[PDB]
């Protein structure tokens, strides 16, 4: 007449869990992410058809972000390692002005510099020349000739680079769970971390995510479909950043309108080095365009959403950042392998109140580059010949609020985001991982 | 008809499969292939004859060859990685003659090179000299004094090589299947390549195969038990090579008939370099002695076999190769670490028709050698003291057909082929690898 303990196996029960996901490629041979160890996967989605289970999960709890971050850094080292060290070039560098019809706002940007260099034989040294960008060159002695410079990072970890074939194309990588695990995708198109997701469909493999890395305006990511969503770990914390996911793409057209020559020399025994040569045509500043309408009016949507976290009849202002290292001060992206830094002066200036014309931002070029989060290594960015033009999609903003405001008005926001991880937090916000626990017990009646 | 399915487990069914076989060995301390880590071999492999089985499998499409290829190349570098780099020696060499009694074949073969050597302290260099073979030395400048030369590859990837301690003996390695896999073996000696084998047995491990590298003749391999066999993928496709397995060895006695000394220098911190010192006695060229009668019989037998698939009233000419770089114009082989490049024209200068006394083949010696499959890596063979007398068995040939002839007659064959995969084709023709599939459907009468 009483109840008995029965074990059931194959029970559909979830447990919060952590493990790793596998690299799953979909359709020059190898890139940081296009890793040689990566397994082509099944393009067919594995849906559970919106099975009616409500689950609460969030960002900044999601350890998958940490894995994407670590995997990418590991991958960088793997592709960067089997390349030519540039240590032989850490010599006194002899600099003067480039004199080629320079436009006034480009004066001082480029340096014509000579140096001694190693060659095929170890008892021989030769005189060589190249063109450098000002930002990476530092003066060594006011007391001596005003022409003596060194490269910015010769007194720290060696700067290395070769492998010109390899690109930096941010090829999307899909991630797959091991058997015994499942990935929960939130199908709510209007959620935030402030509550549970009513509609979840698990998968074995996610869609691909492009490892695009940016410092201020996130490019080529997932766009919101129904509205603009603003997310934060703590909406009232001045120490946290703000992620703005736009539902409106903004097109941005970038260029370095200077026709370059790439020259190369032998440094040593099969050790090649590539460098900037003769620039032909006028010297002009690199720049990026957006239209005013797609920026200025788009921000009004952002403002309407900001006002949902702030009160009514609140004034909102945009402004430029407080500064700091170039890496955080300006917008930064890579294209063609080149690293561009842009001053968003025309983007964050206006004030919003309760009640063909473009924007052009000036940009600069840098070649000796550390990793966003570390200085124990440095890499050199090789030159690109001819003229480079790039077009990208702005999908979101990373903003920083000021240290409060007086009586909840004139709330000021600036470009921000100092955490490289923000680039994946913005994509993985829809996913959680659990383990499968097939055993369980319930009362019943039998023998 | 009122029947039901049973399933039997432990069913004897095979599936073609490609997996890794592992290095098996009887056991000086450091060999290139007989490495520190290799698993002891089964002293008693169990060969099981299969009654009522005919199994078809390939030659030349057999991936066991590919597995040895990738492993031998990768291992070559791993075992020979921690060697002294010879980069420090890339200085100009001031070249003069050798102060000895030099014979007429040796004129121009050796050079006496003088240079400023790097010592273990950064403050010192010394006057040093060494002897080199002509093949490895290139003139630096006709414009300047025609006495300055360089090592052949100082203007490309650096040459690295020391490791005098490493054994290069071609110790045979056995390959064993993982559980769940089996190796099938063909005992039909009359098979001509790919087709059904009516006489088979299975094994757990293959016999051992000696890693002998060669560009023309097959040395110390598997010998035919009855008659010379000629096998190829397509007898009329001259883009493919020809494998000839002999049923008798041909003994060949090779020498570098000069009593050598060795000198050395410390270049850096334990960075020792060894080089050819002077010569005791006079100077004579390297050579190999092949029995004429044996060789004549050898090619006569080859012709008898050629005539099985080709017709009569054809004169078969044996000729020296048409050309190419050294590796494909000479018979390359290694004798105790010494690298011989022998001229075999003396072996292929005759005709056959359908109706002791040795051949003293001249040889050259070379020390700067590129890896067989690539030129991104090279090594400087260490000098060897004393006089070497190298004795080996010719167990086969790799031949190339001079395809294209008037009226399909008077064919000519030449030696050649430097592709290492072709040196394992004979030994591996007997083996196939399959997966074991233990479940099978068993229709019957039970419930």
């Amino acid at each position: 007449e009483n109840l008995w303990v029965t074990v059931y196996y194959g029970v559909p029960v979830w447990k919060d869990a952590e493990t790793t996901l596998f690299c799953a490629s979909d359709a020059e041979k190898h890139n940081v992410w296009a890793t040689h160890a990566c397994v082509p996967t099944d393009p067919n989605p594995q849906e559970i058809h919106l099975e009616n289970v409500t689950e609460e999960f969030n960002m900044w709890k999601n350890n998958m972000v940490e894995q994407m971050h670590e995997d990418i850094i590991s991958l960088w080292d793997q592709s960067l390692k089997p390349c030519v060290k540039l240590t032989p070039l850490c010599v006194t560098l002899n600099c003067t002005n480039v004199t080629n019809n320079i436009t006034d706002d480009m004066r001082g940007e480029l340096k014509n510099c000579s140096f001694n260099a190693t060659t095929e034989l170890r008892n021989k040294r030769v005189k060589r020349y190249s063109l450098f960008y000002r930002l990476d060159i530092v003066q060594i002695d006011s007391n001596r000739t005003k022409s003596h410079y060194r490269l910015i990072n010769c007194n720290t970890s060696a700067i290395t680079q070769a492998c010109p074939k390899v690109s930096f194309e941010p090829i999307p990588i899909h991630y797959c769970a091991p058997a015994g695990f499942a990935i929960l995708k939130c199908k709510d198109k209007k959620f935030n971390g402030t509550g549970p997701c009513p509609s979840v469909s698990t998968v074995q493999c996610t869609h691909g995510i492009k490892p695009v890395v940016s410092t201020q305006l996130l490019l080529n990511g997932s766009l919101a479909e129904e509205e603009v969503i603003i997310r934060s770990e703590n909406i009232t914390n001045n120490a946290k950043n703000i992620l703005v996911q736009l539902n409106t793409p903004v097109q941005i057209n970038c260029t370095r309108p200077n026709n370059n020559t790439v020259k190369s020399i032998r440094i040593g025994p099969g050790q090649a080095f590539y460098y900037t040569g003769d620039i032909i045509g006028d010297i002009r500043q690199a720049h990026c365009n957006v239209s005013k309408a797609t920026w200025n009016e788009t921000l009004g949507k952002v403002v309407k959403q900001l006002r949902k976290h702030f009160g009514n009849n609140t004034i909102i202002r945009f402004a430029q950042s407080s500064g700091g290292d170039l890496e955080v001060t300006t917008h930064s992206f890579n294209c063609g392998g080149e690293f561009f830094y842009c001053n968003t002066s025309g983007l964050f200036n206006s004030t919003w109140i309760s009640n063909n014309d473009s924007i052009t931002l000036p940009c600069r070029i840098k070649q000796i580059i550390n990793m966003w989060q570390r200085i124990g290594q440095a890499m050199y960015a090789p030159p690109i010949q001819g003229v480079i033009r790039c077009v990208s999609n702005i999908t979101g903003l990373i903003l920083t609020r000021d240290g409060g405001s007086t009586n909840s008005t004139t709330e000021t926001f600036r470009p921000g985001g100092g955490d490289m991880r923000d680039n994946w937090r913005s994509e993985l916000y829809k996913y959680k991982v659990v383990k499968i626990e097939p055993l369980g017990v319930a009362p019943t009646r039998c023998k | 008809e009122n029947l039901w399915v049973t399933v039997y487990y432990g069913v004897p069914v095979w599936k073609d499969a490609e997996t890794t076989l592992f290095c098996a060995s009887d056991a000086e301390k450091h060999n290139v292939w007989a490495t520190h880590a290799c698993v002891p071999t089964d002293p008693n492999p169990q060969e099981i004859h299969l009654e009522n089985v005919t199994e078809e499998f390939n030659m030349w499409k057999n991936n066991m060859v590919e597995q040895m290829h990738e492993d031998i190349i990768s291992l070559w570098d791993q075992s020979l990685k921690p060697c002294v780099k010879l980069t420090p020696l890339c200085v100009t060499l001031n070249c003069t003659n050798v102060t000895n009694n030099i014979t007429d074949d040796m004129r121009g073969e050796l050079k006496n090179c003088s240079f400023n050597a790097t010592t273990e302290l950064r403050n010192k260099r010394v006057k040093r000299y060494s002897l080199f073979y002509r093949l490895d030395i290139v003139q630096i400048d006709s414009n300047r004094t025609k006495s300055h030369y360089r090592l052949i590859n100082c203007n490309t990837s650096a040459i690295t090589q020391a490791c005098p301690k490493v054994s290069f003996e071609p110790i045979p390695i056995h390959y064993c299947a993982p559980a769940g896999f089996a190796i099938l073996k063909c005992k039909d000696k009359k098979f001509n390549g790919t087709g059904p084998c009516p006489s088979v047995s299975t094994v757990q491990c293959t016999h051992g195969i000696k890693p002998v590298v060669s560009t023309q003749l097959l040395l110390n391999g598997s010998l035919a038990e009855e008659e010379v066999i000629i096998r190829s993928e397509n007898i009329t496709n001259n883009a493919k090579n020809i494998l000839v397995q002999l049923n008798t060895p041909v003994q060949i006695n090779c020498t570098r008939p000069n009593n050598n000394t060795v000198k050395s220098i410390r270049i850096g911190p334990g960075q020792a370099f060894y080089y050819t010192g002077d010569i005791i006695g006079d100077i004579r060229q390297a050579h190999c002695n092949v029995s004429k009668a044996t060789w004549n019989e050898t090619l006569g037998k080859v012709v008898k076999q050629l005539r099985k698939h080709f017709g009569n009233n054809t004169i078969i000419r044996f000729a020296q190769s048409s050309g190419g770089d050294l590796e494909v114009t000479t018979h390359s082989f290694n004798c105790g670490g010494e690298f011989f490049y022998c001229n075999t024209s003396g072996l292929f200068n005759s005709t056959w028709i359908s109706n002791n006394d040795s051949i003293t083949l001249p040889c050259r010696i070379k020390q700067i050698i590129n890896m067989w499959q690539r030129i991104g890596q090279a090594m400087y063979a260490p000098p060897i003291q004393g006089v070497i007398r190298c004795v080996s068995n010719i167990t086969g040939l790799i031949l190339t057909r001079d395809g294209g002839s008037t009226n399909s007659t008077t064919e000519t064959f030449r030696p050649g082929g430097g592709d290492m995969r072709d040196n394992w084709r004979s030994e591996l023709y007997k083996y196939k690898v399959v997966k074991i599939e233990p479940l099978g459907v068993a229709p019957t009468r039970c419930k």
Partner: antibody
Framework: RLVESGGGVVQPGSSLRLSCAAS????????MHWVRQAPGQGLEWVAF????????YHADSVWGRLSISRDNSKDTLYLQMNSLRVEDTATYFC??????????????????????????????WGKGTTVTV | QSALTQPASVSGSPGQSITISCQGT?????????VSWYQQHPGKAPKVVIY???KRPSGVSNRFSGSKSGNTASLTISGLQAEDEGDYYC??????????FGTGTKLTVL
């Protein structure tokens, strides 16, 4: 081996062009000089040209009228002499400048495109050719 | 650009030590150690006797020496021989980077 050619007898106000064939050296990496000596007189330096043609130096006494030039492919040194004066009568000589690599800190030092530095003295003289105005 | 001043002539008996002076300025002799001396056999282009103030080229004997003090330089010929007879010249480099020769000295062996 320096061989002067183009000398001859001309009238005042005329122009003459000299050339110097050369061999035995990487002409293209070494500088050259023209020197002249009027009969009964001492040596007068006329001009110097750097191996890559980047810098040229002329004596004040010959300015405007004389111009030094070179052809790396021809392995040839030239002197263009215009509006000739009787004072310009002299034997003209093709002279190779002494040079090579500076030795410093146990290394040799080259100029651009592996050029040889000026050891600062004359080494090879040609026979010379007479120019009479 | 003026010539360097040299004595019109020098002389001495065989075996005699003689000196041929050269007077320059702060822009050349007193400017660098780049001075040199040449021997011109009559009818021939000259050869280097001295370079770098006091260095000899291969083939020149140790009888040929010299020195430099301030703006004045000199060639010393010890053990004077009849075979030494010829026209001697000094040469120097300048701030303008021009090359300058002296007036030359005639040598007679008595």
């Amino acid at each position: 081996r320096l061989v002067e050619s183009g000398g001859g007898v001309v009238q005042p106000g005329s122009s003459l062009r000299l050339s110097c064939a050369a061999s035995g050296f990487d002409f293209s990496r070494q500088g050259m000089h023209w020197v002249r000596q009027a009969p009964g007189q001492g040596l007068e330096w006329v001009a110097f040209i750097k191996y890559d043609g980047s810098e040229k130096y002329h004596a004040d006494s010959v300015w405007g009228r004389l111009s030094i030039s070179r052809d790396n492919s021809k392995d040839t040194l030239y002197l263009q002499m215009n509006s000739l004066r009787v004072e310009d009568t002299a034997t003209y000589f093709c002279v190779r400048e002494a040079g090579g690599p500076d030795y410093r800190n146990g290394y040799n030092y080259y100029d651009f495109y592996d050029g040889y530095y000026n050891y600062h003295y004359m080494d090879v003289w040609g026979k010379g050719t007479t120019v009479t105005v | 650009q003026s010539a360097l001043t040299q004595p019109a002539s020098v002389s001495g008996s065989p075996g005699q030590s003689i000196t041929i002076s050269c007077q320059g300025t702060s822009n050349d002799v007193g400017g660098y150690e780049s001075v040199s001396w040449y021997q011109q056999h009559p009818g021939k282009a000259p050869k280097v006797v001295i370079y770098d103030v006091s260095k000899r080229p291969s083939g020149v004997s140790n009888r040929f020496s010299g020195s430099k003090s301030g703006n004045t330089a000199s060639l010393t010929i010890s053990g004077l021989q009849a075979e030494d007879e010829g026209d001697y010249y000094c040469k120097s480099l300048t701030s303008t980077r021009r090359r300058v020769f002296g007036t030359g000295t005639k040598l007679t062996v008595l």
